[PDB]
Amino acid sequence: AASRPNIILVMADDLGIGDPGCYGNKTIRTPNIDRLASGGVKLTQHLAASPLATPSRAAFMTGRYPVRSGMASWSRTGVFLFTASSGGLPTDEITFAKLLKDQGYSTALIGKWHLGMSCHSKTDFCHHPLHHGFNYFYGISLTNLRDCKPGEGSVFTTGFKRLVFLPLQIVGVTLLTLAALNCLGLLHVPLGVFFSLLFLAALILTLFLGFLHYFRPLNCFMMRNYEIIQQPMSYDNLTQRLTVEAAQFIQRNTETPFLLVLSYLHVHTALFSSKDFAGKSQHGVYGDAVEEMDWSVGQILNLLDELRLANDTLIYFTSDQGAHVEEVSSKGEIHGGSNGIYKGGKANNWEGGIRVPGILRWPRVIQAGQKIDEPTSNMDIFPTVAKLAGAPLPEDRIIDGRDLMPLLEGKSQRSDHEFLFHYCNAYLNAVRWHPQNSTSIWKAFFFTPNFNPVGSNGCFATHVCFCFGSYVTHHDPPLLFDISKDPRERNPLTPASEPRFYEILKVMQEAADRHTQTLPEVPDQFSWNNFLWKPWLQLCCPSTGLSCQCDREK
Amino acid sequence: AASRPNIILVMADDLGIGDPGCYGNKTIRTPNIDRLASGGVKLTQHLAASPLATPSRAAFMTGRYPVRSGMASWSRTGVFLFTASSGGLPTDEITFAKLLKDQGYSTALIGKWHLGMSCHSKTDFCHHPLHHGFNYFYGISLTNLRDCKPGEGSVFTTGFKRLVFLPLQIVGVTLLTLAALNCLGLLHVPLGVFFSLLFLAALILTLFLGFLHYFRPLNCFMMRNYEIIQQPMSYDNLTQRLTVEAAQFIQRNTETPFLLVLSYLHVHTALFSSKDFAGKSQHGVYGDAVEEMDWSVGQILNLLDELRLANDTLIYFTSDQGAHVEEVSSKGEIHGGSNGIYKGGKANNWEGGIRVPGILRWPRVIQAGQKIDEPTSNMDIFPTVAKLAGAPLPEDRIIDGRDLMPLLEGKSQRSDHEFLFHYCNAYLNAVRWHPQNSTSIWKAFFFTPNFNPVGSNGCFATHVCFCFGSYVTHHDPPLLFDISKDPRERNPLTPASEPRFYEILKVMQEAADRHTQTLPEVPDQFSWNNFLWKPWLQLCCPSTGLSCQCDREK
Amino acid sequence: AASRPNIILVMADDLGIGDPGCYGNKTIRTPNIDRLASGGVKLTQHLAASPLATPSRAAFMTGRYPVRSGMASWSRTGVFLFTASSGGLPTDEITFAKLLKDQGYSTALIGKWHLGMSCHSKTDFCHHPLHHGFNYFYGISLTNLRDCKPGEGSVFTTGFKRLVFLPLQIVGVTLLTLAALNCLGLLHVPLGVFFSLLFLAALILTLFLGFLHYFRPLNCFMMRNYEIIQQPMSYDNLTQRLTVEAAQFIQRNTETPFLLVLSYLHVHTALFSSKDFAGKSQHGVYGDAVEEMDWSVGQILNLLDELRLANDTLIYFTSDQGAHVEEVSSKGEIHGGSNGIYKGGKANNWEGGIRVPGILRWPRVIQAGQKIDEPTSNMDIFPTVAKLAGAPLPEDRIIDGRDLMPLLEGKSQRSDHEFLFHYCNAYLNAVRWHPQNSTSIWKAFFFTPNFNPVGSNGCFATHVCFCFGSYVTHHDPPLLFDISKDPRERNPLTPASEPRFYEILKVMQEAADRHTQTLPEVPDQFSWNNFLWKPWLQLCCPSTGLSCQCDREK
Ligand SMILES: CCCCCCCCO[C@@H]1O[C@H](CO)[C@@H](O)[C@H](O)[C@H]1O
Ligand SMILES: CCCCCCCCO[C@@H]1O[C@H](CO)[C@@H](O)[C@H](O)[C@H]1O
Ligand SMILES: CCCCCCCCO[C@@H]1O[C@H](CO)[C@@H](O)[C@H](O)[C@H]1O
Ligand SMILES: CCCCCCCCO[C@@H]1O[C@H](CO)[C@@H](O)[C@H](O)[C@H]1O
Ligand SMILES: CCCCCCCCO[C@@H]1O[C@H](CO)[C@@H](O)[C@H](O)[C@H]1O
Ligand SMILES: CCCCCCCCO[C@@H]1O[C@H](CO)[C@@H](O)[C@H](O)[C@H]1O
Ligand SMILES: *[C@@H]1O[C@H](CO)[C@@H](O)[C@H](O)[C@H]1NC(C)=O
Ligand SMILES: *[C@@H]1O[C@H](CO)[C@@H](O)[C@H](O)[C@H]1NC(C)=O
Ligand SMILES: *[C@@H]1O[C@H](CO)[C@@H](O)[C@H](O)[C@H]1NC(C)=O
Ligand SMILES: *[C@@H]1O[C@H](CO)[C@@H](O)[C@H](O)[C@H]1NC(C)=O
Ligand SMILES: *[C@@H]1O[C@H](CO)[C@@H](O)[C@H](O)[C@H]1NC(C)=O
Numbered sequence A, B, C: 001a002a003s004r005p006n007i008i009l010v011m012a013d014d015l016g017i018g019d020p021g022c023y024g025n026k027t028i029r030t031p032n033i034d035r036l037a038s039g040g041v042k043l044t045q046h047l048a049a050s051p052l053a054t055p056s057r058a059a060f061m062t063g064r065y066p067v068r069s070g071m072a073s074w075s076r077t078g079v080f081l082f083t084a085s086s087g088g089l090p091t092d093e094i095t096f097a098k099l100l101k102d103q104g105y106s107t108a109l110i111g112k113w114h115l116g117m118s119c120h121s122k123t124d125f126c127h128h129p130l131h132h133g134f135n136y137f138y139g140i141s142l143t144n145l146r147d148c149k150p151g152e153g154s155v156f157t158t159g160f161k162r163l164v165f166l167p168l169q170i171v172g173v174t175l176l177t178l179a180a181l182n183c184l185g186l187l188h189v190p191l192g193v194f195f196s197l198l199f200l201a202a203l204i205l206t207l208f209l210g211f212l213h214y215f216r217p218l219n220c221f222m223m224r225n226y227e228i229i230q231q232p233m234s235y236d237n238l239t240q241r242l243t244v245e246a247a248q249f250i251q252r253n254t255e256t257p258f259l260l261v262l263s264y265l266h267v268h269t270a271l272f273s274s275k276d277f278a279g280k281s282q283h284g285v286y287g288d289a290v291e292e293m294d295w296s297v298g299q300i301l302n303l304l305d306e307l308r309l310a311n312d313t314l315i316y317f318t319s320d321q322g323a324h325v326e327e328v329s330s331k332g333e334i335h336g337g338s339n340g341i342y343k344g345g346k347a348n349n350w351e352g353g354i355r356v357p358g359i360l361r362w363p364r365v366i367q368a369g370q371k372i373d374e375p376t377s378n379m380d381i382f383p384t385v386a387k388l389a390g391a392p393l394p395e396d397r398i399i400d401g402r403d404l405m406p407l408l409e410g411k412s413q414r415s416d417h418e419f420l421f422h423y424c425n426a427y428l429n430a431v432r433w434h435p436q437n438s439t440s441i442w443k444a445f446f447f448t449p450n451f452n453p454v455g456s457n458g459c460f461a462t463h464v465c466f467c468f469g470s471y472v473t474h475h476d477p478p479l480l481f482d483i484s485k486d487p488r489e490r491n492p493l494t495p496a497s498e499p500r501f502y503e504i505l506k507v508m509q510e511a512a513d514r515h516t517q518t519l520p521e522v523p524d525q526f527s528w529n530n531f532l533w534k535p536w537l538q539l540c541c542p543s544t545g546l547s548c549q550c551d552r553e554k
């Protein structure tokens, strides 16, 4: 309440709720994260606003459902995949960094943004962190990917199938069949037809080889503020470089209230580790990455102690969504983390998709060793930090998040989230209703993703499930659950609360009905126009030839 | 004589007469085959009707010289090389399986057929085993080949030279020369000429890469009856899978007279072995394959003993032709077996080409431990088994084979084969005359194959010798031998029997003359029309894309 | 003086003056070369006439500056790089081999020529050793190169950049950009434009792959006299094969005065060694090659002792120019030798480029253990050997070399080289003035090569420095040195001899002025016409197809 503490918000990438020690895992070392939970409050029902990166991060920055800002797609691509695309967090949205910057906070983003970069010109930076309330940025504008690390697979394999391999197999089989029919004297094949087929194969293959050659340097690079500093990105000491930049930022601000958003690349695939962590872990390179990340967190923690800032710094730890079930190396090396008890994971709205770790420590104000089981959202951070900074909330627009501090301080027992809505990109997937004066958590599913292998935990054919069409199965009436009684979501409710369906579904359907009546009519940041590679947007660190390449970090 | 015993005919692929233990080899373990010879009769002059697979097997199935059925080519290709080709054992030919099936035998083929599959439509199966007297088929329609096993060479290298590498070298050298002449100002080369050359190179290379990609799955696959069960064929436990199918067939017929043809893939190249045999042998992976094959034979033998069928089962063991001398890995790893004393081998009519093991066991009727040195043919099985089954011989056509049982039972001392003819595919290579009341074996050569390396045992330039033109050398007068005196064929007769040439060559030339007067005028199953790949004949096990691929065996 | 001794001239390739034991190196074993220096005279200021192979060897053969014979280029290519090019030592030049052959010497060249081969027809051999005074030739017509040994790099990388990789990157980026603009609806791209781009890429790549495939066999091959004997050249026992041919030549001439030029392939890159030398050395495969070369020299030395020819054989040892500083494996493996104290090296006119070992032994006439510090040239051999053979010098043309024997015999104290000129290919680089009755060595630089990495010893961007344009920096006034006081050339003279510049530069500039007034107007053996690959000049040892390939040595 206008006391202006320092604020550090830490976001892991695809860390599952079953990964940290303090959430039940007995073999992953996260001693510094569980230190945070033991010294503070550990949220038990903390819900990301989407099970994919870009929309979850949009909602975290704005305190607003991603559909309110057109940051959720209608197509299969739910996150930005090219740095040189025009979609991004709209210029008229207000982040908590801007709210806090307007109150005199020093603001910095270290690590992953994934909310766009430029719009019309490669230097307008309309969606860049520095245009969205951050005074300093060190990190990457897009995301880590398999493709960013050579010999680690590709997130584009499904796409290569429709657009490259299958057309090229049709052309090739047509050419071989025509040549045989010609040779057997069943068909005169004009050379023009052979020419057309060879020409088409050569064009498809050239485009494909161009994509293979250029994607990593054009899309996997490090920036400081508006400049490229390493292209392609090096994984050498990556996490340590992020740690040093975050520690240095804090040291520049020991007498100035500051806001640090520390947005790790871990543990999104293309897993990696320094020499100090490699090989020595529970579940493969995944474990080394998880606990390299915990090391980095401890380094920041030890800094605040050394600098005597720990008592009046609020620290929040989360991941943007749950771990990715379908993430399996071609050699079967099991990447992706654990969501523990809960079903599903990244890219669906089963509990393992959206229930993420949520830890808050603020030693001066928040009682240590607490545990909040009430439903909270990662959109709640926006109003929490705004009030703490003395920044008024925006009054020209809806804010879906709710201040956490009355709950964190014991002034309140039940959170201000009687209804929450679970979107699958742009499509309303599930409604959550934790009724008042009640303990149960009603959860209806307008649809469910068709898990690709039988009985399997995920959608291993398309690597992620989708939200619409052939990949999904609608349910009428809505398909109801009680998350209070079974977290594992392993039995769909019907015989128990049957004398209650139509009365409680009507109050949940009206909530959705009332809800989608506040959704206005906004540009789609994921339209083809805004998703596709635009040559004039491509940032290219000057090198020899037309090559994009430098290591100004070195 | 209408006693209807069970009948098992076992055919190895390219097993040389110098390979089995019971034929003199002191380092290959064939304990189950030599068991057969010790319990039965071991033929010393058993002669395949051709030194190549397809015609030898045609003659074995029909009891008839391959030229009688148009199953011998005039070109360099002597065996079928594509499953989707229309040549095959003609529909009007009668196999011993059909003769025996018409007497109520249960009939089965396990393993290699190599006598065609379909004619006009991919499902007419006009040449398939089930249309030629077999009630059940488990195996492959074509043959094992180097190309069926990845990283094992190719039988098509000679062909790649004429059709791919040499044209592509001409185009490439023309293009480089033209570019230099253009650049030096000696010749204006229109872009159309460069375009034509590049276009032609691209087309040749695409066709070649298509062949490299598709040949194995389109031609190396397992079938049961009319259905593909594994495509491409897996070599995992291959011989054991064949053993189980053959044992199961016998077990379905313990009270029904049955005919099992067991036609191994061993020891034709693409050699292979289970884990139980790999590495532990005499002469490389060849030895492991030979004695894996002997293991399989012992398993059938032990079955008949367990089931109490051994006493009234006739068993025959042979290979389709002699071992392949010219079969040498690129790394020099010596594949192909041994023909021992005899000269030549697979694809020529020297003794090592056509003299093959021939073992018969029938404990109730055939005295154990016997040894027949009289000339016999692998065409003799057809009338042997027909009489045993009570099936009358076809009387509308010539049968060249002769019942073996009077000889096997000691009722006769000299076989009914005063003259035999040795074809090199469609061309009469050699005449054999074992005169009556005589011991010598006169063998004339109308021509001989030009062994490619000097003094070498085979034709290592084209991998096999041929039967016509540049690869051969005619001889007038016919070039005479006495196989009784030297098996090694190491000295051509002239000074010894010189006062006998013109009198005995005239009686052998009249035999050939009389012989080729019975050869009628028949379709060529090896014409280009019938040898070449026809797209509409291609069996393709349904998979994703246009790919031919399944493992319904699994 | 018409005593007709035998004469052996030994030339290493790129052996630096800091490599032999007898010149100060304490870790390279050259026991047979330093034996030569201990038994004879070791020249301290022996200067190659050029720091590149072809012109240095031209000047050695003719006793004449390379510009006098048009054997120095104006372009970046300073040596012949194709056997099938028409440039070469002009037919009107006279070598010392021809002078000596005309006096009745038996003459032989063993090893590297690098002065051309044929002119208009592949069999005119207008520039071949046998047309330039040698009666016998065993060796290579061009040079050893990285490209002659597979997996050893390429001397053409810079060229691949301008002519292949950069054009192909422009075409590829244009194609990818056009495809994206077309796809985004900003530009209709006609198929003709895509076709043109693909066609151009295919042509560039075909030419490049043709160069990669054909360069080694077409340019790296062994000859005896006018015939190819091994194509491509084998490195197996290469140095030993050269040793045997040189020893055999001597043995054919134990009673006939003979001239042996033994021109090693060592130690030019594509380094190599027999089994007897591999792995056991100071500075890598370079050391093994250097001391394999010393072994070969000892073998010739021991021969003359065995044959009792050592006392009246004059032996000379040198290398054609200094070691190559910029020669570094891609894996950083340090190839190229050491120039010791002196600056620069191969392809520049700093002292390390042109100051080479120079050893003479002639036990009957030359006092052992001597050391000549006077400036001498590798052009001095021509008149030395001519007088020894009784051959008169050519009187229709200038000879720049000067007989060494008055100096070697102690009849004279100062050499006849008051002025020498240091050419960078065709461009006068430096003037050397060792004034008379003086000890200092004045050296002016009209220009200097711009060493590519900062402070680096060489020009590592273009692998060698050049002589003109962007790679060089002119100096007015000429940039003066005193080589007597500092060999390392590490301080440019100005404050010391400042009251002497304009008076001594005017006498050195007049020397150059007077000098270039004797340079006549001659064909350029390095014109594009004479450097470029001509298809009709290509020697091709007959093989299968259009392939150039044989091992008649075997
Ligand atoms: C005629 C139809 C062509 C459509 C091709 C669209 C071009 C796709 O653009 C791709 O985007 C990536 C940029 O990050 C790059 O790696 C590749 O250069 C590029 O091929
Ligand atoms: C300094 C920020 C970028 C300005 C440089 C503009 C030129 C960008 O050049 C880019 O190079 C890429 C591969 O080399 C291509 O794939 C892109 O089409 C091209 O736009
Ligand atoms: C214009 C001249 C073209 C003649 C090419 C003949 C096509 C050869 O057909 C080949 O047969 C095999 C089928 O088993 C396949 O592996 C290949 O698809 C195919 O290229
Ligand atoms: C089920 C028995 C076959 C019916 C399927 C008909 C389609 C066969 O498709 C075949 O695919 C091959 C490679 O994919 C091509 O090389 C052949 O030209 C093509 O005929
Ligand atoms: C239209 C412009 C084309 C110019 C290409 C010049 C051809 C270069 O000639 C090259 O020389 C080498 C001979 O030793 C060979 O290895 C290659 O065959 C050849 O490509
Ligand atoms: C015997 C001396 C040479 C006579 C043979 C003339 C034919 C030379 O053929 C050469 O083959 C090379 C690659 O194969 C090509 O690159 C050359 O353009 C071509 O001229
Ligand atoms: C923080 O609070 C604890 C407990 O009240 C105290 O021991 C510690 O010294 C405080 N640190 C600072 C920097 O005030
Ligand atoms: C703990 O994490 C590992 C991998 O990070 C996972 O395999 C395991 O299932 C997790 N624990 C539980 C109880 O799920
Ligand atoms: C087969 O014959 C042998 C010897 O006559 C006998 O020992 C054996 O029991 C017989 N087997 C059967 C199944 O009749
Ligand atoms: C026995 O077989 C091996 C290979 O199978 C062969 O090398 C050997 O020559 C054979 N024995 C005789 C006597 O030929
Ligand atoms: C060479 O000279 C030395 C010393 O004068 C002598 O010992 C040796 O025998 C001579 N050799 C010949 C071959 O004359």
Ligand SMILES: *[C@@H]1O[C@H](CO)[C@@H](O)[C@H](O)[C@H]1NC(C)=O
Residues within 6 Å of the ligand: C018, C019, C024, C025, C026, C027, C028, C282, C283, C286, C287, C337, C338, C339, C340, C341
């Ligand atoms: C001796 O030679 C080696 C390599 O041949 C070189 O590294 C070293 O510098 C040389 N010695 C001196 C004193 O330069």
Ligand SMILES: [Ca+2]
Residues within 6 Å of the ligand: A013, A014, A052, A053, A268, A320, A321
């Ligand atoms: Ca994520």
Ligand SMILES: [Ca+2]
Residues within 6 Å of the ligand: B013, B014, B052, B053, B268, B320, B321
């Ligand atoms: Ca065979």
Ligand SMILES: [Ca+2]
Residues within 6 Å of the ligand: C013, C014, C052, C053, C268, C320, C321
């Ligand atoms: Ca040199």
